[PDB]
Swiss-Prot record, chain A:
It comes from the Bacteria. It comes from Thermus thermophilus (strain ATCC 27634 / DSM 579 / HB8). DNA-dependent RNA polymerase catalyzes the transcription of DNA into RNA using the four ribonucleoside triphosphates as substrates. Belongs to the RNA polymerase beta' chain family. The RNAP catalytic core consists of 2 alpha, 1 beta, 1 beta' and 1 omega subunit. When a sigma factor is associated with the core the holoenzyme is formed, which can initiate transcription. This is DNA-directed RNA polymerase subunit beta'.
DNA sequence: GCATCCGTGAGTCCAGGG
DNA sequence: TATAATGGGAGCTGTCACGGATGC
Protein backbone atom coordinates (compact mmCIF):
# COMPACT_ATOMS: atom_id res chain seq x y z
CA UNK A 1 0.00 0.00 0.00
CA UNK A 2 1.49 3.39 -0.98
CA UNK A 3 2.21 5.71 1.96
CA UNK A 4 -0.82 7.49 3.41
CA UNK A 5 -3.50 6.10 1.10
CA UNK A 6 -5.92 3.99 3.12
CA UNK A 7 -7.67 0.69 2.50
CA UNK A 8 -11.00 0.47 0.69
CA UNK A 9 -11.60 -2.80 2.58
CA UNK A 10 -11.43 -3.87 6.22
CA UNK A 11 -9.56 -6.53 8.15
CA UNK A 12 -11.30 -9.92 8.39
CA UNK A 13 -13.68 -9.90 5.40
CA UNK A 14 -13.85 -11.98 2.24
CA UNK A 15 -13.04 -10.46 -1.16
CA UNK A 16 -13.58 -11.48 -4.79
CA UNK A 17 -10.97 -12.04 -7.49
CA UNK A 18 -10.48 -8.76 -9.32
CA UNK A 19 -12.30 -6.83 -6.59
CA UNK A 20 -10.14 -3.78 -5.93
CA UNK A 21 -8.59 -3.73 -2.45
CA UNK A 22 -7.44 -0.09 -2.54
CA UNK A 23 -7.30 2.76 -5.12
CA UNK A 24 -4.22 1.14 -6.69
CA UNK A 25 -4.56 -2.51 -5.65
CA UNK A 26 -6.66 -5.24 -7.27
CA UNK A 27 -6.83 -8.74 -5.79
CA UNK A 28 -5.99 -11.52 -8.24
CA UNK A 29 -7.73 -14.09 -6.03
CA UNK A 30 -10.69 -14.60 -3.70
CA UNK A 31 -10.52 -15.07 0.05
CA UNK A 32 -10.05 -13.37 3.41
CA UNK A 33 -8.17 -10.08 3.45
CA UNK A 34 -5.82 -9.37 6.36
CA UNK A 35 -4.02 -6.26 7.60
CA UNK A 36 -0.24 -6.40 7.80
CA UNK A 37 1.13 -3.36 9.64
CA UNK A 38 -1.45 -0.78 10.71
CA UNK A 39 0.25 2.60 10.68
CA UNK A 40 -2.68 4.49 12.27
CA UNK A 41 -4.87 3.13 15.08
CA UNK A 42 -8.04 5.17 15.75
CA UNK A 43 -9.80 4.48 19.05
CA UNK A 44 -13.45 5.56 19.38
CA UNK A 45 -13.78 6.23 23.12
CA UNK A 46 -17.40 5.96 24.30
CA UNK A 47 -18.78 8.88 26.33
CA UNK A 48 -22.18 8.82 28.08
CA UNK A 49 -23.14 12.17 29.66
CA UNK A 50 -26.14 14.30 30.61
CA UNK A 51 -26.68 17.69 28.90
CA UNK A 52 -29.39 20.33 28.50
CA UNK A 53 -31.04 22.57 25.94
CA UNK A 54 -33.84 25.18 26.10
CA UNK A 55 -36.29 25.49 23.19
CA UNK A 56 -39.52 27.33 22.34
CA UNK A 57 -42.41 25.03 23.17
CA UNK A 58 -44.06 25.46 19.75
CA UNK A 59 -40.93 24.57 17.78
CA UNK A 60 -40.31 21.32 19.69
CA UNK A 61 -41.09 17.89 18.23
CA UNK A 62 -41.86 16.00 21.43
CA UNK A 63 -40.30 12.53 21.51
CA UNK A 64 -39.05 10.15 24.21
CA UNK A 65 -35.66 9.65 22.47
CA UNK A 66 -33.86 10.81 19.34
CA UNK A 67 -31.81 8.74 16.89
CA UNK A 68 -29.02 10.48 14.94
CA UNK A 69 -29.91 12.73 12.01
CA UNK A 70 -33.47 12.97 13.37
CA UNK A 71 -35.19 16.34 13.52
CA UNK A 72 -35.35 17.67 17.09
CA UNK A 73 -37.24 20.95 16.50
CA UNK A 74 -38.17 23.39 13.73
CA UNK A 75 -37.87 27.12 14.35
CA UNK A 76 -39.98 29.62 12.37
CA UNK A 77 -37.45 32.39 13.11
CA UNK A 78 -33.91 32.74 14.49
CA UNK A 79 -33.74 31.85 18.19
CA UNK A 80 -30.98 32.69 20.68
CA UNK A 81 -30.17 29.89 23.12
CA UNK A 82 -29.12 31.73 26.27
CA UNK A 83 -26.98 30.70 29.20
CA UNK A 84 -28.64 29.82 32.49
CA UNK A 85 -25.38 29.96 34.44
CA UNK A 86 -22.32 32.17 34.78
CA UNK A 87 -18.94 30.66 34.08
CA UNK A 88 -16.07 30.08 31.70
CA UNK A 89 -16.99 28.36 28.43
CA UNK A 90 -15.44 25.04 27.36
CA UNK A 91 -16.49 24.48 23.71
CA UNK A 92 -16.05 20.92 22.38
CA UNK A 93 -17.02 20.88 18.68
CA UNK A 94 -17.66 17.29 17.60
CA UNK A 95 -17.85 16.14 13.97
CA UNK A 96 -21.37 17.54 13.97
CA UNK A 97 -22.79 19.53 16.85
CA UNK A 98 -21.11 20.77 19.99
CA UNK A 99 -21.06 20.66 23.78
CA UNK A 100 -20.75 23.78 25.89
CA UNK A 101 -19.61 23.31 29.46
CA UNK A 102 -19.61 26.33 31.76
CA UNK A 103 -17.31 25.87 34.77
CA UNK A 104 -16.88 27.97 37.96
CA UNK A 105 -13.46 27.73 39.71
CA UNK A 106 -12.41 24.07 39.10
CA UNK A 107 -16.00 22.67 39.12
CA UNK A 108 -18.43 22.29 36.15
CA UNK A 109 -21.67 24.19 36.54
CA UNK A 110 -23.62 23.66 33.27
CA UNK A 111 -23.46 21.25 30.31
CA UNK A 112 -25.34 22.42 27.20
CA UNK A 113 -25.81 20.47 23.96
CA UNK A 114 -26.00 22.28 20.63
CA UNK A 115 -27.43 19.96 17.94
CA UNK A 116 -26.97 20.62 14.22
CA UNK A 117 -28.39 23.97 13.17
CA UNK A 118 -27.07 25.82 16.25
CA UNK A 119 -24.12 28.12 15.51
CA UNK A 120 -22.15 28.71 18.75
CA UNK A 121 -21.66 32.44 19.40
CA UNK A 122 -18.97 31.91 22.05
CA UNK A 123 -15.30 30.95 21.80
CA UNK A 124 -13.47 28.43 23.96
CA UNK A 125 -12.42 29.90 27.30
CA UNK A 126 -14.94 32.78 27.18
CA UNK A 127 -16.59 34.31 30.25
CA UNK A 128 -20.40 34.42 30.10
CA UNK A 129 -23.06 35.95 32.37
CA UNK A 130 -26.55 34.52 32.77
CA UNK A 131 -28.87 35.20 29.84
CA UNK A 132 -26.25 35.95 27.26
CA UNK A 133 -26.62 34.18 23.90
CA UNK A 134 -24.45 31.06 23.61
CA UNK A 135 -25.59 29.92 20.16
CA UNK A 136 -28.15 30.68 17.46
CA UNK A 137 -30.51 28.06 16.02
CA UNK A 138 -31.92 28.98 12.58
CA UNK A 139 -34.40 26.08 12.07
CA UNK A 140 -34.92 22.39 11.13
CA UNK A 141 -32.39 21.72 13.90
CA UNK A 142 -31.58 18.05 14.27
CA UNK A 143 -29.35 15.50 15.94
CA UNK A 144 -25.81 14.96 14.64
CA UNK A 145 -24.99 11.69 12.91
CA UNK A 146 -22.31 10.77 15.49
CA UNK A 147 -24.38 11.26 18.70
CA UNK A 148 -27.68 9.74 19.86
CA UNK A 149 -30.22 10.85 22.48
CA UNK A 150 -30.93 7.83 24.68
CA UNK A 151 -33.46 9.33 27.09
CA UNK A 152 -35.20 12.71 27.00
CA UNK A 153 -36.67 14.52 30.02
CA UNK A 154 -38.60 17.77 29.59
CA UNK A 155 -39.72 20.60 31.86
CA UNK A 156 -42.37 23.10 30.80
CA UNK A 157 -41.75 26.67 31.97
CA UNK A 158 -43.35 29.76 30.53
CA UNK A 159 -43.27 29.40 26.75
CA UNK A 160 -40.27 27.06 26.57
CA UNK A 161 -39.10 23.52 27.23
CA UNK A 162 -35.89 22.56 29.01
CA UNK A 163 -34.67 19.20 27.71
CA UNK A 164 -32.40 17.09 29.93
CA UNK A 165 -30.83 14.74 27.35
CA UNK A 166 -29.02 11.53 28.32
CA UNK A 167 -26.70 11.56 25.30
CA UNK A 168 -24.31 8.81 24.20
CA UNK A 169 -21.62 9.25 21.55
CA UNK A 170 -17.99 8.43 20.69
CA UNK A 171 -14.91 10.65 20.34
CA UNK A 172 -11.95 9.47 18.21
CA UNK A 173 -8.25 9.66 19.07
CA UNK A 174 -5.58 8.62 16.55
CA UNK A 175 -2.14 7.10 17.17
CA UNK A 176 0.76 6.78 14.72
CA UNK A 177 2.31 3.29 14.77
CA UNK A 178 6.05 2.95 14.21
CA UNK A 179 7.72 -0.02 12.47
CA UNK A 180 9.22 -1.26 15.76
CA UNK A 181 5.76 -1.53 17.38
CA UNK A 182 3.10 -4.26 17.20
CA UNK A 183 -0.66 -3.85 17.60
CA UNK A 184 -1.75 -6.32 20.28
CA UNK A 185 -5.48 -5.58 19.87
CA UNK A 186 -7.81 -6.90 17.13
CA UNK A 187 -10.17 -4.87 14.95
CA UNK A 188 -13.39 -3.90 16.76
CA UNK A 189 -12.23 -4.93 20.24
CA UNK A 190 -13.29 -3.24 23.47
CA UNK A 191 -10.57 -1.74 25.64
CA UNK A 192 -10.89 -0.46 29.23
CA UNK A 193 -8.78 2.01 31.18
CA UNK A 194 -5.24 0.62 31.34
CA UNK A 195 -5.48 -1.98 28.55
CA UNK A 196 -2.54 -1.94 26.13
CA UNK A 197 -3.24 -1.35 22.45
CA UNK A 198 0.20 -1.20 20.77
CA UNK A 199 3.41 -2.55 22.31
CA UNK A 200 6.81 -0.97 21.62
CA UNK A 201 10.50 -1.59 22.35
CA UNK A 202 10.62 0.78 25.33
CA UNK A 203 7.64 1.14 27.70
CA UNK A 204 7.33 4.96 27.45
CA UNK A 205 6.36 4.48 23.79
CA UNK A 206 3.51 2.03 24.49
CA UNK A 207 -0.14 2.76 23.68
CA UNK A 208 -2.36 2.22 26.73
CA UNK A 209 -6.10 2.90 26.62
CA UNK A 210 -7.25 6.01 28.51
CA UNK A 211 -10.94 5.12 28.85
CA UNK A 212 -13.39 2.63 27.34
CA UNK A 213 -13.78 2.46 23.58
CA UNK A 214 -13.43 0.43 20.38
CA UNK A 215 -10.42 0.02 18.08
CA UNK A 216 -10.24 0.77 14.35
CA UNK A 217 -7.21 0.04 12.16
CA UNK A 218 -6.17 2.27 9.26
CA UNK A 219 -3.41 2.58 6.63
CA UNK A 220 -1.86 -0.90 6.71
CA UNK A 221 1.63 -1.19 5.28
CA UNK A 222 0.31 -3.94 3.01
CA UNK A 223 -2.75 -6.20 2.78
CA UNK A 224 -2.57 -10.00 2.68
CA UNK A 225 -5.40 -11.76 0.83
CA UNK A 226 -5.47 -15.45 1.78
CA UNK B 1 10.63 -12.31 -1.31
CA UNK B 2 12.75 -9.97 0.80
CA UNK B 3 11.61 -8.86 4.26
CA UNK B 4 10.51 -5.30 4.96
CA UNK B 5 11.73 -3.79 8.22
CA UNK B 6 8.30 -4.49 9.68
CA UNK B 7 8.16 -8.15 8.63
CA UNK B 8 11.77 -8.55 9.79
CA UNK B 9 11.05 -7.19 13.28
CA UNK B 10 7.78 -9.14 13.55
CA UNK B 11 9.42 -12.50 12.79
CA UNK B 12 12.40 -11.81 15.06
CA UNK B 13 10.02 -10.86 17.88
CA UNK B 14 7.98 -14.02 17.33
CA UNK B 15 11.18 -16.10 17.52
CA UNK B 16 12.33 -14.49 20.78
CA UNK B 17 8.91 -14.92 22.37
CA UNK B 18 8.55 -18.53 21.21
CA UNK B 19 11.85 -19.37 22.84
CA UNK B 20 10.64 -17.71 26.06
CA UNK B 21 7.42 -19.74 25.75
CA UNK B 22 9.43 -22.98 25.49
CA UNK B 23 11.19 -21.94 28.69
CA UNK B 24 7.85 -21.30 30.42
CA UNK B 25 6.49 -24.64 29.16
CA UNK B 26 9.50 -26.34 30.68
CA UNK B 27 8.83 -24.58 34.00
CA UNK B 28 5.18 -25.71 33.94
CA UNK B 29 5.40 -29.29 32.61
CA UNK B 30 8.72 -30.30 34.17
CA UNK B 31 9.83 -31.69 30.80
CA UNK B 32 13.11 -30.87 29.01
CA UNK B 33 13.18 -27.56 27.08
CA UNK B 34 15.05 -29.37 24.30
CA UNK B 35 12.43 -32.12 24.15
CA UNK B 36 9.66 -29.49 23.98
CA UNK B 37 11.46 -27.50 21.29
CA UNK B 38 11.86 -30.69 19.26
CA UNK B 39 8.18 -31.66 19.59
CA UNK B 40 6.98 -28.17 18.61
CA UNK B 41 9.41 -28.29 15.69
CA UNK B 42 8.17 -31.78 14.72
CA UNK B 43 4.60 -30.50 14.51
CA UNK B 44 5.46 -27.27 12.65
CA UNK B 45 7.65 -29.04 10.08
CA UNK B 46 5.50 -32.15 9.71
CA UNK B 47 6.13 -35.85 9.95
CA UNK B 48 7.97 -35.50 6.61
CA UNK B 49 11.00 -34.41 8.65
CA UNK B 50 10.85 -36.28 11.97
CA UNK B 51 14.24 -37.77 13.00
CA UNK B 52 16.20 -38.39 16.22
CA UNK B 53 18.33 -35.69 17.90
CA UNK B 54 21.81 -36.45 19.34
CA UNK B 55 21.32 -34.48 22.56
CA UNK B 56 17.84 -35.77 23.40
CA UNK B 57 17.85 -38.67 25.86
CA UNK B 58 14.69 -40.15 24.28
CA UNK B 59 14.48 -41.22 20.60
CA UNK B 60 12.13 -38.64 18.99
CA UNK B 61 9.55 -41.06 17.50
CA UNK B 62 6.06 -40.01 16.22
CA UNK B 63 4.66 -42.03 19.14
CA UNK B 64 6.63 -39.96 21.67
CA UNK B 65 5.97 -36.67 19.89
CA UNK B 66 2.25 -37.50 19.95
CA UNK B 67 2.41 -38.35 23.67
CA UNK B 68 4.18 -35.06 24.43
CA UNK B 69 1.81 -33.11 22.17
CA UNK B 70 -1.08 -34.61 24.13
CA UNK B 71 0.48 -33.88 27.53
CA UNK B 72 0.80 -30.32 26.22
CA UNK B 73 -2.71 -30.06 24.77
CA UNK B 74 -4.19 -31.05 28.17
CA UNK B 75 -2.92 -27.86 29.86
CA UNK B 76 -5.18 -25.01 31.07
CA UNK B 77 -5.89 -22.17 28.64
CA UNK B 78 -3.43 -19.76 30.28
CA UNK B 79 -0.70 -22.43 30.05
CA UNK B 80 -1.64 -23.84 26.63
CA UNK B 81 -1.26 -20.20 25.49
CA UNK B 82 2.50 -20.78 25.46
CA UNK B 83 2.16 -23.75 23.08
CA UNK B 84 0.61 -21.46 20.46
CA UNK B 85 3.40 -18.98 21.19
CA UNK B 86 6.06 -21.64 20.54
CA UNK B 87 4.45 -22.94 17.35
CA UNK B 88 4.24 -19.37 16.07
CA UNK B 89 7.91 -18.91 16.95
CA UNK B 90 9.11 -21.95 15.01
CA UNK B 91 7.12 -20.93 11.94
CA UNK B 92 8.66 -17.45 12.16
CA UNK B 93 12.13 -19.01 12.46
CA UNK B 94 11.74 -21.00 9.24
CA UNK B 95 10.38 -17.94 7.48
CA UNK B 96 13.23 -15.68 8.67
CA UNK B 97 15.96 -18.06 7.49
CA UNK B 98 14.21 -18.59 4.15
CA UNK B 99 13.87 -14.85 3.65
CA UNK B 100 17.57 -14.23 4.28
CA UNK B 101 19.04 -17.00 2.10
CA UNK B 102 20.28 -14.40 -0.48
CA UNK B 103 22.67 -12.68 1.95
CA UNK B 104 24.60 -15.92 2.41
CA UNK B 105 25.10 -16.16 -1.37
CA UNK B 106 26.28 -12.57 -1.65
CA UNK B 107 28.87 -13.22 1.08
CA UNK B 108 29.99 -16.67 -0.12
CA UNK B 109 30.67 -15.59 -3.72
CA UNK B 110 33.80 -13.88 -2.31
CA UNK B 111 35.40 -16.95 -0.68
C1' DG C 1 7.12 -45.23 -38.22
C1' DC C 2 9.81 -42.60 -39.82
C1' DA C 3 12.55 -40.28 -40.13
C1' DT C 4 16.13 -36.54 -37.45
C1' DC C 5 18.76 -35.00 -33.46
C1' DC C 6 21.40 -36.53 -29.53
C1' DG C 7 25.03 -38.66 -26.24
C1' DT C 8 29.11 -41.69 -26.01
C1' DG C 9 33.51 -44.11 -26.53
C1' DA C 10 37.09 -45.33 -29.85
C1' DG C 11 41.55 -44.81 -32.37
C1' DT C 12 49.12 -50.66 -33.55
C1' DC C 13 53.69 -51.56 -30.40
C1' DC C 14 57.80 -49.95 -27.54
C1' DA C 15 60.65 -46.17 -24.97
C1' DG C 16 61.04 -41.92 -21.40
C1' DG C 17 59.29 -38.14 -19.15
C1' DG C 18 61.72 -32.21 -19.12
C1' DT D 1 29.19 -11.81 18.38
C1' DA D 2 25.30 -6.05 16.63
C1' DT D 3 25.96 0.30 11.31
C1' DA D 4 24.49 -2.14 7.06
C1' DA D 5 25.25 -5.44 4.04
C1' DT D 6 20.08 -10.10 0.28
C1' DG D 7 20.49 -14.25 -6.98
C1' DG D 8 27.50 -16.61 -10.03
C1' DG D 9 30.68 -16.91 -13.42
C1' DA D 10 32.59 -19.37 -17.88
C1' DG D 11 32.61 -20.43 -22.02
C1' DC D 12 36.23 -22.18 -26.48
C1' DT D 13 35.25 -24.92 -31.35
C1' DG D 14 38.91 -28.73 -38.08
C1' DT D 15 36.32 -36.96 -35.68
C1' DC D 16 32.97 -40.63 -36.40
C1' DA D 17 29.82 -44.49 -36.32
C1' DC D 18 26.09 -46.03 -33.73
C1' DG D 19 22.33 -46.97 -30.38
C1' DG D 20 18.74 -44.67 -28.30
C1' DA D 21 15.84 -40.53 -28.01
C1' DT D 22 13.01 -36.92 -29.48
C1' DG D 23 9.92 -34.35 -33.14
C1' DC D 24 7.39 -34.96 -37.95
Amino acid sequence: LPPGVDALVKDGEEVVKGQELAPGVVSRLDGVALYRFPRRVRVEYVKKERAGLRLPLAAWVEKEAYKPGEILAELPEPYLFRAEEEGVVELKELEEGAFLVLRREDEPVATYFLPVGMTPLVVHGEIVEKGQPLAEAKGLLRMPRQVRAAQVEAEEEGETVYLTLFLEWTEPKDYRVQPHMNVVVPEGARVEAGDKIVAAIDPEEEVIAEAEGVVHLHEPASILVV
Amino acid sequence: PLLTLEEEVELARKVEEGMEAIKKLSEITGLDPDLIREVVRAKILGSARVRHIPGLKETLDPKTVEEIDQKLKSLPKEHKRYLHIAREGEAARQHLIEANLRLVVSIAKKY
